[PDB]
């Protein structure tokens, strides 16, 4: 049920005798990818043709690519000056996946740099707090990077995050809009990227309240389009009479919406979260996997082009949609849901930089590698290599070990009645949120490593996109479950 | 030759503030002299919260160097409102800015804030600009999202007339005529015809919509956009699949297929998806299973696992 690209017939998308700009770009991309596959040895073969490129994951080249980007960036990176915590996250998460350790001195530098991005009033910005205002996206990127590079010592940065919990929560509340959306920053745009980044951080740091979550589920649900994926945002027509989705289903926004909704399912509020159409989201997800001629990589939108970064955005959303589908069918009353083999083939054959060069991973052939595509190609490769499930028995096991008498101080709500009703409700909420956050498992015997075990990378966690070995100690610290 | 701001008479009173990275920062960017200097003085301006023309000028200098600098964009809009600046002048400046920076979240949001604040009685000029701006990239996501917001926001205020809605559908029809595989324009059609609050729903408007969809499929049988639209349409309006089946059956080998266009290999996977779902509608679970298995075995092997899942769902 997961055929290799090399075992299938490669045919262009048919024209139907009606040319268009879309088809011109598609045909061009089909040629580009198929030509590289033709020059490359089939990763599954014991005997390769002589003269053909070896597709093995060039981990040392990718490490060197990340090293160069890590200690000094050229002047043209100024376009990413407001995204510096992303550059950190893309680097440190990739190194985790590649299995490359940072020394303590380098880790300390990562922590210190990020702490300079934290404002006392609350939240991280894309640069130093004396230069940039807080933003939901750098807040996610900085928090995850601290999970990866930090620790519980006085110089480990986790201590500082714990102290910042109330201020971060207050920043989150300032971002809150009555319809359930959040501005990304003061005066900023409202979309599901904001919701995703906020919910991840609020989950990990134990700063979820009822007043934070009001309408949040409704905003996300109405982002779902007739295609089954999710758009950037929904518009509230004047609590609102109705909500209407604002653009196309996209991999970036579908990833954010599925992950957001999933995080909300562990919150014990009444009639919450408002349901999404899980079957349609799964359908949209699988339909975005490219044909053999385009290497089996994912595209981000119908009739656009395949791109390595969508291995994470679309591919990493698959286990989430699958679990939601599983729950929906259980509410009334196994082969892989996407081609796990083909996606790895796209990664190894098409998404790696040509050997003996700068290293790194990329959008597609003809595109320069960057940190963003390095991280998201690898995060997607991990999802394809390792069969991820959300396990009810693991969640149950987590519930049994949870210590509700241990925790950091409760957040003080903005509105007097914005918190949980009482301590029983609040502690039950903490238990459910923590227990489910640690519910993702790799299924033993589910592993598929295309090209041999030297291609194996570490296991990322769906929804959060950090390694489980980072997630567990991090969330245990803030919930005092260590 | 660059003249430093420390040598400019207009900035003599200002003491620049350095970037506070701390000791030995990771991912440092080697800034140009121009960008470092501008940011050194912006830090000083923002710190003292100066709202002035020189501060406004400085924000422009910076966003030109980094169109993604959300902090500086936020400060710029704050200056515009504080100084009661000409918002129409700013919108004109953004016309050039937006074309060169299609994927900038903050440029597009800046436009939104300007339109929201200007709040024109008739937004026709902006609608026209937006249509024009789509020439270099007909699929620019932020533009389509912005177009959705514009019509939704201004319709809420009761400022979109029936003539305006009508010409918008005409433009959308033209977009899909030029490229029927433009999924962004298909999405816009759904807003115009189905999702917007003021959209007409009658048995006759459904008829017209079916005709358009079917005609689109016959013109481009392998167009996933048209197929997805059809499936969304029937699902949204709770319409049975069976009565339309005659128009779709030929692809499994009201407007009907051509008496077939060249370069149309059969079967079309999504036509088989339609047929299997039509069997499901008829309680014929074994007939659906066989179609799903064929999609899994032969006709859409990339999705072998998903179609197998769908087959097991019948059994």
């Amino acid at each position: 049920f997961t055929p290799s690209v090399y075992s299938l017939v490669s045919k262009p998308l048919p024209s139907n005798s009606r040319p268009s700009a879309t088809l011109d770009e598609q045909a061009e991309t089909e040629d580009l990818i198929s030509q590289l596959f033709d020059l490359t040895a089939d990763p599954n073969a014991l005997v390769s043709e002589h003269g053909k490129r070896y597709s093995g994951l060039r981990k040392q080249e990718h490490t060197q690519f990340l090293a160069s980007s890590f200690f000094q960036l050229p002047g043209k990176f100024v376009s990413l000056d407001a995204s510096r915590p992303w550059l950190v996250f893309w680097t440190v998460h990739s190194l985790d996946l590649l299995g490359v350790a940072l020394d303590q001195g380098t880790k300390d530098r990562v922590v210190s740099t990020l702490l300079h991005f934290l404002s006392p009033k609350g939240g991280f910005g894309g640069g130093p707090a004396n230069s940039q205002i807080p933003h939901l996206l750098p807040t996610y990127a900085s928090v995850c990077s601290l999970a990866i590079a930090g620790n519980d010592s006085s110089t480990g940065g986790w201590k500082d995050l714990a102290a910042a919990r109330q201020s971060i929560y207050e920043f989150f509340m300032r971002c809150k809009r009555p319809d359930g959306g959040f501005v990304v920053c003061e005066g900023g745009e409202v979309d599901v990227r904001g919701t995703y980044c906020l919910l991840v951080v609020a989950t990990l740091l134990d700063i979820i309240t009822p007043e934070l979550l009001h309408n949040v589920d409704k905003f996300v649900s109405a982002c779902q389009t007739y295609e089954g994926g999710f758009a950037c945002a929904s518009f509230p027509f004047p609590e609102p009479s109705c909500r209407v989705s604002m653009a196309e289903a996209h991999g970036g926004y579908t990833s954010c919406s599925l992950n957001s909704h999933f995080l909300l399912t562990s919150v014990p509020l009444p009639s919450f979260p408002l349901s999404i159409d899980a079957n349609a989201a799964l359908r949209w997800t699988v339909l975005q996997q490219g044909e053999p001629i385009e290497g089996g990589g994912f595209r981000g939108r119908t009739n656009k082009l395949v791109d390595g970064c969508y291995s994470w955005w679309v591919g990493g959303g698959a286990p989430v949609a699958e679990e939601l589908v599983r729950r929906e069918k259980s509410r009334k009353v196994i082969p892989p849901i996407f081609n796990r083999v083909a996606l790895q083939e796209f990664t190894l054959v098409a998404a790696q930089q040509d050997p003996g060069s700068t290293g790194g991973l990329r959008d597609k052939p003809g595109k320069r590698p960057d940190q963003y595509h390095t991280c998201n190609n690898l995060s997607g490769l991990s999802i394809a290599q390792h069969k991820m499930s959300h396990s009810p028995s693991t969640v149950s096991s987590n519930r049994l070990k949870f210590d509700a008498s241990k925790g950091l101080p409760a957040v003080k709500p903005v509105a007097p009645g914005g918190g949980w009703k009482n301590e029983d409700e609040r502690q039950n909420a903490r238990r459910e949120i923590w227990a489910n956050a640690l519910g993702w498992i790799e299924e033993e015997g589910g592993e598929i490593i295309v090209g041999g075990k030297d291609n194996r990378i570490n296991t990322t966690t769906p929804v959060f996109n950090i390694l489980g070995l980072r997630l567990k100690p991090f969330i245990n610290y803030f919930y005092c479950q260590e | 030759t660059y003249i430093p701001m420390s040598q400019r008479r207009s900035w003599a009173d200002v003491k620049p503030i350095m970037q506070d990275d701390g000791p030995n920062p990771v991912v440092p960017i080697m800034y140009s002299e121009e960008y470092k200097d501008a940011m050194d003085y912006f830090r000083a301006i923002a710190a003292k919260e100066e709202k002035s023309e020189r501060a406004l000028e400085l924000t422009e200098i910076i966003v030109r160097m980094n169109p993604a600098h959300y902090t500086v964009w936020q400060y710029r809009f704050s200056l515009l409102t504080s100084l009661n600046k000409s918002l129409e002048d700013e919108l004109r400046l953004m016309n050039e800015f937006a074309v060169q920076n299609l994927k900038s979240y903050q440029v597009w949001h800046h436009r939104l804030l300007l339109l929201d604040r200007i709040s024109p009685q008739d937004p026709v000029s902006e609608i026209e600009y937006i249509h024009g701006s789509l020439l270099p990239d007909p699929k620019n996501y932020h533009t389509w999202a912005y177009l959705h917001w514009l019509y939704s926001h201004f319709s809420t205020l009761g400022r979109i007339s029936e003539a305006q809605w009508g010409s918008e559908l005409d433009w959308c029809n033209e977009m899909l005529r030029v490229d029927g595989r433009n999924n962004s324009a298909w999405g816009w059609r759904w807003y115009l015809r189905v999702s917007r609050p003021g959209a007409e729903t009658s048995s006759r408007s459904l008829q017209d919509e079916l005709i358009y969809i079917l005609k689109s499929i016959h013109l481009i049988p392998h167009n996933v956009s048209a197929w997805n639209y059809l499936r969304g349409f029937l699902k949204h309006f709770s319409l049975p699949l069976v009565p339309i089946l005659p128009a779709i059956l030929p692809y499994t080998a009201f407007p009907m297929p051509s008496d077939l266009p060249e370069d149309t290999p059969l079967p079309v996977p999504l036509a088989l998806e339609y047929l299997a779902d039509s069997f499901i509608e008829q309680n014929r679970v074994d007939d659906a299973a066989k179609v799903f298995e064929k999609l899994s075995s032969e006709y859409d092997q990339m999705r072998a696992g998903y179609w197998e899942f769908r087959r097991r769902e019948c059994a």
């Binding site: 894309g126 933003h135 970036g252 963003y372 595509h373 | -």
Partner: peptide, 6 residues
Amino acid sequence: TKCVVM
């Protein structure tokens, strides 16, 4: 034609 997430 780079990718932009922020």
